[PDB]
Amino acid sequence: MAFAEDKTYKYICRNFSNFCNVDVVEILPYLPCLTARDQDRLRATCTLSGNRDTLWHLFNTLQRRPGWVEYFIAALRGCELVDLADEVASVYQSYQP
Amino acid sequence: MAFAEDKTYKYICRNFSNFCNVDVVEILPYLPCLTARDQDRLRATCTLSGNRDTLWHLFNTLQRRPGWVEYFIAALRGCELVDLADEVASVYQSYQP
Amino acid sequence: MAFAEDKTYKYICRNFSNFCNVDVVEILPYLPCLTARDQDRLRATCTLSGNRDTLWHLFNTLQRRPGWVEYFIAALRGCELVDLADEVASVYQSYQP
Amino acid sequence: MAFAEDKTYKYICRNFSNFCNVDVVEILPYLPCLTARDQDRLRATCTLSGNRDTLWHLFNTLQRRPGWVEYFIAALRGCELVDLADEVASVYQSYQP
Amino acid sequence: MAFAEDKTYKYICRNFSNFCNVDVVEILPYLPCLTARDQDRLRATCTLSGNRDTLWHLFNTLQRRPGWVEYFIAALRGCELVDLADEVASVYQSYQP
Amino acid sequence: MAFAEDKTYKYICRNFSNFCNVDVVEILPYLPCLTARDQDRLRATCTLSGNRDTLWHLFNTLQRRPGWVEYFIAALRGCELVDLADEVASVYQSYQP
Amino acid sequence: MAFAEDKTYKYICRNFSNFCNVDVVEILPYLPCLTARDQDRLRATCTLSGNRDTLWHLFNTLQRRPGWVEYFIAALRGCELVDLADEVASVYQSYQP
Amino acid sequence: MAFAEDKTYKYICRNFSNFCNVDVVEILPYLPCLTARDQDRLRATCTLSGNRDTLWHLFNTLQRRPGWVEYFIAALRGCELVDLADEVASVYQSYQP
């Protein structure tokens, strides 16, 4: 649900600092939900501002597509950030009926 | 119909908080109904004031030209805001004969 | 002469919509007739209200100091608005003895 | 003609989404009509704002100089956007006497 | 307490110049008390107007949400602005019962 | 003394044009004597109306609260308008017992 | 009730200075009871005259239309002025039979 | 002298178009007269608005500190803009007693 998605995103920003390792350029191919465009923005942002900065735009960009959370859990798993994926899914499923 | 357009726009502000996602700078390319001026007015506003803020200016500008609702529904769809577009179209059709 | 200058400015507003192409910030480097303070006013206006809009405020500012017309034709030529400059000069010289 | 160029640009924005593949940084060397300065602005915008995005600034920037459409048709052809140039040229010549 | 928060914010502005290093874009991610939007406004402002400048909008923006002081002290510590955090917390606790 | 402060402001406006250098948006952070409101008023004034214009509104605002002179002299020094500050302090101390 | 709404508003002005945090430009999107023309006036006022100032004009406009209190309490909540919303509702319900 | 500096700045704007080659990001390190902060503004402006545009803010920014002309001449010389440096210095000494 959107309410769950929205609460997830709120969690992530609560805890953004922990996430870091998340690699924007690595993570994007796993997010076909993002506009073929919006990836460019993130990917170009990263060149300019460095990863961890752009990470913030990406999540804000990620939470933009209904259904995004499932995409993301998949993404971290593609990124072998399994412990992180497990961390969000916990948060995510916590807000589902 | 206009009655439908105004009810649509009136709906939009009622439920604006939900819309949140529309990316001003993103959606404008789909809205050739808007004044070549007024698009500059939006984006420069976007630069000065940030996105969601500029969003509001965009809608008020949008509802100014006859036919905008179809333009808008098309726009959201290019922005893959399908659920958002489907939501608007519903509100729109609901007011058609 | 002033009569020519005034007829020119009146021409410009009577054909204002046609000019648009003029970029205000650029009309600004080439135009030392404008007060060091009024350029700030325009550009800040330009940022705030967008270009075409700011253009009108720009011309309105420009026609205030004797000699502005020569400055302007030079400016467009610096902006490679040669056909535009050629148009004004014609309009301008049409009002010279 | 001015009228023909303008309809083209209005056509382009009607159909902008289709254009996308157009590469701003690639296309700029082919546009000596654009100000040596403006290219910088597009090229820097592109770095800041991403390609398809800056694309929009570019067309709006391109249509700024009379004669631009031929420059543009030439450009697409230099960019092996033969199908695109043919698409535009069609639109352009459709508006010439 | 509210009284403590305001005295703190008044202190911050008393002593703003010392703060400078504080990086708006770096520090915002630690500040979920700020609206997901007002960070855009700070950040877009930051892009437009520069860092230390936006720092100011941010503090005025930060002091907007009850409980913000705790949020800020935490943030600076994450920004390894330990001496700064120590400095404010000192100011802060000085105004609590 | 109050008598000293007023002669100073009368000095400032009688020499207002000389000051310009003072950057309105820049100087405000040094002036906590100003109401947390009134800074909004100046800056917003600055944005719509431009700097030197706003300077007058700034000075006009500043001279309203007792003690402002010490604040202002300090401010200019923060703005490294040392010669400007030196000029005012001279004017200021010239009117003290 | 209308009387309850009025009693709330007098509370507001007697405590107006406290309530300035309300960000005018921010709050309007939650208030569809306001006349679509009349919001422009607030923002135009807000921009011209600054926020806290505009708050008062906003309130005076808001209390014009019956039912506004529910609109407002909701509004603050959207602004995560939960404590502020919590403050008003108390004052409000204290005046209902 | 101040008289000399301003006449130079006026010259600079009267010939600004000629100057362009001046590279903002390159030139700033040679100007410790500008506030370490205003470099950010220029350096960030260059980013948003392009190099030709920011040069303009820079000179107006440069002419802001008494003594700036010597700094600028030094700077251009640091920038191997020897012909440019000779051009300005000539203009400068032309207004000294």
mmCIF file of C-alpha atoms in Angstrom, chain D residues 2-82:
data_model
loop_
_atom_site.group_PDB
_atom_site.id
_atom_site.type_symbol
_atom_site.label_atom_id
_atom_site.label_comp_id
_atom_site.label_asym_id
_atom_site.label_seq_id
_atom_site.Cartn_x
_atom_site.Cartn_y
_atom_site.Cartn_z
ATOM 1 C CA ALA D 2 9.592 32.844 -39.980
ATOM 2 C CA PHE D 3 6.097 31.341 -40.004
ATOM 3 C CA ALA D 4 7.473 28.013 -41.203
ATOM 4 C CA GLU D 5 10.239 27.922 -38.597
ATOM 5 C CA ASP D 6 7.773 28.708 -35.814
ATOM 6 C CA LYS D 7 5.282 25.979 -36.756
ATOM 7 C CA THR D 8 8.204 23.595 -36.770
ATOM 8 C CA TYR D 9 9.146 24.597 -33.253
ATOM 9 C CA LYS D 10 5.508 24.335 -32.214
ATOM 10 C CA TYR D 11 5.505 20.927 -33.912
ATOM 11 C CA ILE D 12 8.658 19.967 -32.039
ATOM 12 C CA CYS D 13 7.127 20.718 -28.633
ATOM 13 C CA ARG D 14 3.910 18.959 -29.585
ATOM 14 C CA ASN D 15 6.081 15.961 -30.293
ATOM 15 C CA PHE D 16 9.068 16.605 -28.002
ATOM 16 C CA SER D 17 8.867 13.268 -26.212
ATOM 17 C CA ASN D 18 9.631 11.497 -29.491
ATOM 18 C CA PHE D 19 12.844 13.462 -29.951
ATOM 19 C CA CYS D 20 14.627 12.442 -26.680
ATOM 20 C CA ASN D 21 17.481 10.464 -28.391
ATOM 21 C CA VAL D 22 18.747 13.845 -29.558
ATOM 22 C CA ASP D 23 22.010 14.359 -27.677
ATOM 23 C CA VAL D 24 22.578 17.963 -26.518
ATOM 24 C CA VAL D 25 26.383 17.819 -26.166
ATOM 25 C CA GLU D 26 26.650 15.866 -29.437
ATOM 26 C CA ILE D 27 24.286 18.200 -31.292
ATOM 27 C CA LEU D 28 25.758 21.559 -30.200
ATOM 28 C CA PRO D 29 28.895 21.629 -32.386
ATOM 29 C CA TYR D 30 26.433 21.396 -35.282
ATOM 30 C CA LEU D 31 24.669 24.572 -34.216
ATOM 31 C CA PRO D 32 27.015 27.507 -34.972
ATOM 32 C CA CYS D 33 23.837 29.564 -34.972
ATOM 33 C CA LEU D 34 23.736 29.235 -31.172
ATOM 34 C CA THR D 35 25.780 31.729 -29.209
ATOM 35 C CA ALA D 36 29.272 30.577 -28.241
ATOM 36 C CA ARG D 37 27.904 31.480 -24.807
ATOM 37 C CA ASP D 38 24.582 29.589 -25.036
ATOM 38 C CA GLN D 39 26.221 26.276 -25.877
ATOM 39 C CA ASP D 40 28.057 26.687 -22.579
ATOM 40 C CA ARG D 41 24.676 27.178 -20.918
ATOM 41 C CA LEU D 42 23.174 24.095 -22.553
ATOM 42 C CA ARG D 43 26.368 22.099 -22.093
ATOM 43 C CA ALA D 44 26.567 23.166 -18.444
ATOM 44 C CA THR D 45 22.787 22.724 -18.001
ATOM 45 C CA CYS D 46 23.153 19.258 -19.440
ATOM 46 C CA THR D 47 25.816 18.477 -16.888
ATOM 47 C CA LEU D 48 23.549 19.892 -14.180
ATOM 48 C CA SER D 49 20.141 18.898 -15.457
ATOM 49 C CA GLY D 50 20.699 15.859 -17.668
ATOM 50 C CA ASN D 51 20.317 15.416 -21.394
ATOM 51 C CA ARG D 52 16.715 14.959 -22.425
ATOM 52 C CA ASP D 53 16.060 17.770 -20.003
ATOM 53 C CA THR D 54 18.541 20.263 -21.463
ATOM 54 C CA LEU D 55 17.245 19.208 -24.857
ATOM 55 C CA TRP D 56 14.209 21.343 -24.147
ATOM 56 C CA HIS D 57 16.315 24.396 -23.314
ATOM 57 C CA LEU D 58 18.186 23.784 -26.526
ATOM 58 C CA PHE D 59 15.203 23.747 -28.869
ATOM 59 C CA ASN D 60 13.876 26.838 -27.163
ATOM 60 C CA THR D 61 17.406 28.161 -27.485
ATOM 61 C CA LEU D 62 17.693 26.916 -31.080
ATOM 62 C CA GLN D 63 14.472 28.498 -32.322
ATOM 63 C CA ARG D 64 15.881 31.760 -31.024
ATOM 64 C CA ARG D 65 17.935 32.534 -34.111
ATOM 65 C CA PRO D 66 16.253 32.997 -37.482
ATOM 66 C CA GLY D 67 17.441 30.341 -39.927
ATOM 67 C CA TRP D 68 17.768 27.814 -37.120
ATOM 68 C CA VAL D 69 15.585 25.113 -38.669
ATOM 69 C CA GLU D 70 17.997 24.527 -41.574
ATOM 70 C CA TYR D 71 20.806 24.514 -39.016
ATOM 71 C CA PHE D 72 18.790 21.960 -37.086
ATOM 72 C CA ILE D 73 17.930 19.715 -40.046
ATOM 73 C CA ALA D 74 21.631 19.798 -40.869
ATOM 74 C CA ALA D 75 22.404 18.919 -37.252
ATOM 75 C CA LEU D 76 20.164 15.850 -37.023
ATOM 76 C CA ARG D 77 21.702 14.655 -40.296
ATOM 77 C CA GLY D 78 25.183 15.108 -38.883
ATOM 78 C CA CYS D 79 23.888 13.114 -35.913
ATOM 79 C CA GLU D 80 22.670 10.270 -38.168
ATOM 80 C CA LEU D 81 19.161 11.113 -37.010
ATOM 81 C CA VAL D 82 18.166 10.839 -40.641
#
